Amino acid sequence: GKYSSDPEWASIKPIELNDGSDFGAMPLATISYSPEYLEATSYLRAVMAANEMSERALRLTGDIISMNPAHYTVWIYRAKILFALGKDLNEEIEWLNKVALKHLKNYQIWHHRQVLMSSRAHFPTLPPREQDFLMEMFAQDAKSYHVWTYRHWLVRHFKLWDHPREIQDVEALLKADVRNNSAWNHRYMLRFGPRDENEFDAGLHNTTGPSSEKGRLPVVDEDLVDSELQYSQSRILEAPENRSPWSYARGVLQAAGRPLSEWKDFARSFVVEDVAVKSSHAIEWLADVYAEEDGSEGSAAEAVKMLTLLKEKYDPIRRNYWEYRIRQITASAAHATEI
Amino acid sequence: VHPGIPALFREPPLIHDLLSTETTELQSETVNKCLPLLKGIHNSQKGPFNKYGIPALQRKDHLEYLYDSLEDYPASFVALDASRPWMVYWALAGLCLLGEDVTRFRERVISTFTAAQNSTGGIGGGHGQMSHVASSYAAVLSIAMVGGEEAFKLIDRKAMWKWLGKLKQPDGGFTVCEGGEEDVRGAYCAMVVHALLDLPLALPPEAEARQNGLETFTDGLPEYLSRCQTYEGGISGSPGSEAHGAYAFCALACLCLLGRPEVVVPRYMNIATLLPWLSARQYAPEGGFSGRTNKLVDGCYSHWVGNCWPLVQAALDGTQPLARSSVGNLYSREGLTRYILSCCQCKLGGLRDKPGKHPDSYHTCYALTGLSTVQYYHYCTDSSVSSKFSSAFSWKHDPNFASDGQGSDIGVFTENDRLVPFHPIFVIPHKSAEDIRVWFENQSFDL
Numbered sequence: 172g173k174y175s176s177d178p179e180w181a182s183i184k185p186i187e188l189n190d191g192s193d194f195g196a197m198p199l200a201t202i203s204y205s206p207e208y209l210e211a212t213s214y215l216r217a218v219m220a221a222n223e224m225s226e227r228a229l230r231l232t233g234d235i236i237s238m239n240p241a242h243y244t245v246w247i248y249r250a251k252i253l254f255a256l257g258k259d260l261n262e263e264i265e266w267l268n269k270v271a272l273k274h275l276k277n278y279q280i281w282h283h284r285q286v287l288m289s290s291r292a293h294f295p296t297l298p299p300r301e302q303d304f305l306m307e308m309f310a311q312d313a314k315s316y317h318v319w320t321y322r323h324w325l326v327r328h329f330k331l332w333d334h335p336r337e338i339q340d341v342e343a344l345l346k347a348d349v350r351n352n353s354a355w356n357h358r359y360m361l362r363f364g365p366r367d368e369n370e371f372d373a374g375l376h377n378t379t380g381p382s383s384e385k386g387r388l389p390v391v392d393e394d395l396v397d398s399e400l401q402y403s404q405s406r407i408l409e410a411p412e413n414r415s416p417w418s419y420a421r422g423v424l425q426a427a428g429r430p431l432s433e434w435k436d437f438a439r440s441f442v443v444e445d446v447a448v449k450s451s452h453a454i455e456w457l458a459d460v461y462a463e464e465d466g467s468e469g470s471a472a473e474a475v476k477m478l479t480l481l482k483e484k485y486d487p488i489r490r491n492y493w494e495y496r497i498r499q500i501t502a503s504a505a506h507a508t509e510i
Numbered sequence: 511v512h513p514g515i516p517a518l519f520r521e522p523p524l525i526h527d528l529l530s531t532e533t534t535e536l537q538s539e540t541v542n543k544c545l546p547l548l549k550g551i552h553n554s555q556k557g558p559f560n561k562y563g564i565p566a567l568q569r570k571d572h573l574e575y576l577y578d579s580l581e582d583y584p585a586s587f588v589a590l591d592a593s594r595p596w597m598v599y600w601a602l603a604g605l606c607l608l609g610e611d612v613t614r615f616r617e618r619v620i621s622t623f624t625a626a627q628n629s630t631g632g633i634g635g636g637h638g639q640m641s642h643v644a645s646s647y648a649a650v651l652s653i654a655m656v657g658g659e660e661a662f663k664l665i666d667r668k669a670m671w672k673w674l675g676k677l678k679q680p681d682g683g684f685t686v687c688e689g690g691e692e693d694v695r696g697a698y699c700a701m702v703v704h705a706l707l708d709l710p711l712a713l714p715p716e717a718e719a720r721q722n723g724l725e726t727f728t729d730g731l732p733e734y735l736s737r738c739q740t741y742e743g744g745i746s747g748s749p750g751s752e753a754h755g756a757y758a759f760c761a762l763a764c765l766c767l768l769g770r771p772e773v774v775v776p777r778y779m780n781i782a783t784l785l786p787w788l789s790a791r792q793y794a795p796e797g798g799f800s801g802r803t804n805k806l807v808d809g810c811y812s813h814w815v816g817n818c819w820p821l822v823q824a825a826l827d828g829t830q831p832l833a834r835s836s837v838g839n840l841y842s843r844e845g846l847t848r849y850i851l852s853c854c855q856c857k858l859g860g861l862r863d864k865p866g867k868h869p870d871s872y873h874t875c876y877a878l879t880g881l882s883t884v885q886y887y888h889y890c891t892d893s894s895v896s897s898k899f900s901s902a903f904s905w906k907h908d909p910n911f912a913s914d915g916q917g918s919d920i921g922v923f924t925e926n927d928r929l930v931p932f933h934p935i936f937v938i939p940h941k942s943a944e945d946i947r948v949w950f951e952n953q954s955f956d957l
């Protein structure tokens with residue numbers, strides 16, 4: 172073994188693996204580890220038991236990571252060492268970038284990154300090439316959940332909601348694939364996500380109010396709302412069946428306290444007339460417009476018509492949900508009729 | 511050309527955008543791989559095909575696959591080292607679903623988890639790994655399934671309580687381990703462990719969270735979960751992240767551990783946005799569920815999304831008295847069943863993410879869990895097995911029998927395909943969850 176014969180490691184004795192192949196019955200789902208991994212992890216057990224914060228221990232974590240980057244314990248212990256020894260975290264980030272590029276789907280790497288980057292002493296401001304590296308990751312997997320989650324944290328930590336690269340990178344990703352829902356979600360955070368430093372983080376404003384009003388902004392910037400709705404319409408016209416911008420628009424209207432009927436004419440434009448339908452989302456939009464924000468007679472029947480188109484032709488797998496909505500609307504109209 | 515297969519499952523959607531992007535290229539390829547399987551005309555499919563044109567669940571093949579998955583792996587599988595407790599859980603769960611008696615695994619389970627439990631509390635991935643809520647969740651559920659006093663006695667409850675207390679965060683959520691990430695998966699796993707072991711509601715007297723005004727494990731928790739809802743209606747892993755089916759299950763299940771679904775869910779979640787987002791998870795012709803908007807169907811979401819439905823439907827229906835009308839199923843049981851049975855079965859045994867993927871025990875476990883869900887009415891009642899999480903232990907089940915003819919809410923599996931029912935929150939058999947909870951309730955908390 173490389174560790175057992177290294178004088179660098181002579182001062183500590185490894186802790187042999189206790190699998191359970193001795194205590195009694197045979198353990199389940201065992202792995203016949205390679206000799207190298209067995210030795211390394213036996214030395215890791217020893218250094219962690221002694222709470223050792225050293226350069227050799229740091230190198231050991233790096234070696235184990237090169238064999239198994241899905242070892243959650245080693246990442247956490249590595250972070251402890253880095254801080255305890257006052258290591259250059261700029262160098263650790265440069266090393267971490269290489270690991271991340273080799274293991275695109277590994278999420279442990281990205282929590283580790285957050286742990287390091289959260290240190291104000293080492294990273295008082297946004298590093299000059301941090302956003303570029305995120306784009307290097309997105310160029311390979313544009314919907315990576317862990318990278319997007321890290322980017323959300325990054326925006327909050329360094330207060331980047333109005334930073335031009337955040338919106339520029341979103342728009343670049345949406346130019347490449349307008350159906351990238353991860354990019355739309357980030358855009359919502361940038362434009363309408365809560366920013367109050369004295370509050371716990373939240374995806375939506377007004378979580379202290381009634382749940383039906385979750386998302387409602389305390390103060391609305393009307394020009395910003397108009398601009399975001401116009402952006403949404405423009406993207407929709409590029410691909411009308413794309414759910415993401417329709418959902419984004421619903422979110423914006425909810426945030427602004429505006430009714431869905433503001434897009435009544437827009438929604439109608441995708442259902443001209445036999446009916447030629449260019450978007451099922453337009454149908455669902457009209458359904459909600461006629462059902463909720465319209466209190467005139469005939470409106471309920473129109474909503475039911477839209478939902479029937481959905482259940483029979485344009486989104487039939489969700490028939491049971493469409494029928495539920497029809498029953499809700501029918502009961503509502505009946506209650507109104509009783510009055 | 512089986513006549514029992516509706517056009518909905520034999521054709522791509524009617525509406526198609528002209529614009530091609532990576533998203534549509536992947537979606538198209540997935541649909542094209544699924545279509546011959548959905549039609550029941552692929553050479554890899556084994557019969558018999560039922561009146562709905564759907565192949566039988568290959569019970570024997572899946573049994574052998576799951577049994578084999580509990581044995582030794584080569585050195586190349588080292589990446590599973592931290593996930594060994596999950597490996598045990600996924601296999602035991604699958605075997606249970608398929609109707610096996612797993613009590614013979616008692617001593618082997620004990621041997622596995624003895625070395626993985628840390629003296630300072632909790633269970634990690636194995637000897638020398640720090641405690642983690644996911645491995646602890648997997649371990650506790652495995653112990654529940656095999657049952658027995660000896661397995662129950664394995665857990666150091668007081669140390670588990672002290673360790674879990676260290677994970678409680680000022681914002682109400684939980685980290686998954688000391689120094690680890692905080693996400694809703696952490697909250698769900700922690701609270702399941704807390705409930706099944708009947709741990710004290712109060713935080714340990716020396717818990718750090720007490721400095722921030724928190725007094726119990728549930729203090730600030732549903733508020734935290736509320737802050738994980740997104741503008742889409744779904745629920746994300748942490749505040750601000752993208753809505754995802756796996757996290758929606760974690761959050762909804764966790765809320766239903768806090769009180770009656772019809773009380774807690776509407777209070778902390780906007781159901782008006784949650785419902786359509788959940789509904790939109792299901793695609794045709796595939797029939798299965800995707801995890802998030804504009805991504806692909808995956809058989810494991812048969813559980814993560816699939817089991818959101820009994821929870822949401824209970825929130826709408828309310829608690830059932832054993833001494834009322836229901837909204838019914840708001841998704842397509844037919845679609846999900848077709849996806850699982852026609853598309854997710856590997857001819858050599860095991861179930862898979864999607865056609866073109868190798869099977870694994872994770873996808874086998876959760877596809878079967880999803881298949882079981884469509885076969886039962888799951889509902890909560892006013893009678894609990896707990897002598898004091900009361901609603902969480904009030905869940906009961908009745909069979910939803912295989913159907914005949916066409917309809918919007920039908921069972922297109924055969925009764926030969928019937929699996930054991932699982933608890934919607936605990937993801938183990940009801941009796942297993944009941945037995946472990948009751949046993950711990952009658953044990954004094956150690957000094």
Ligand SMILES: Cc1ccccc1S(=O)(=O)N(CCN(Cc1cncn1C)c1ccc(C#N)cc1)CC1CCN(C(=O)OC(C)(C)C)CC1
Pocket residue numbers: 241278587589590593695808810863869870872873
């Ligand atoms: C545990 C593991 C160990 C090594 C490599 C990957 C993983 S995992 O991706 O996290 N895992 C679990 C399911 N999964 C991936 C997945 C499968 N289907 C949908 N998803 C999200 C998750 C789960 C939790 C989290 C978090 N936080 C992120 C992803 C995937 C299972 C199915 C695929 N697996 C399997 O085929 O085994 C090999 C890869 C070792 C040969 C491993 C188990």
Ligand SMILES: CC(C)=CCC/C(C)=C/CC/C(C)=C/COP(=O)(O)OP(=O)(O)O
Pocket residue numbers: 314315316317644695698699754756757760800801802805806808
């Ligand atoms: C009980 C507890 C452990 C629950 C956790 C379940 C598990 C599935 C967590 C969700 C992971 C999420 C980030 C999916 C992204 O992966 P992806 O991009 O590969 O998959 P996707 O394309 O379907 O979103």
Ligand SMILES: [Zn+2]
Pocket residue numbers: 808809810811863873
């Ligand atoms: Zn999956």
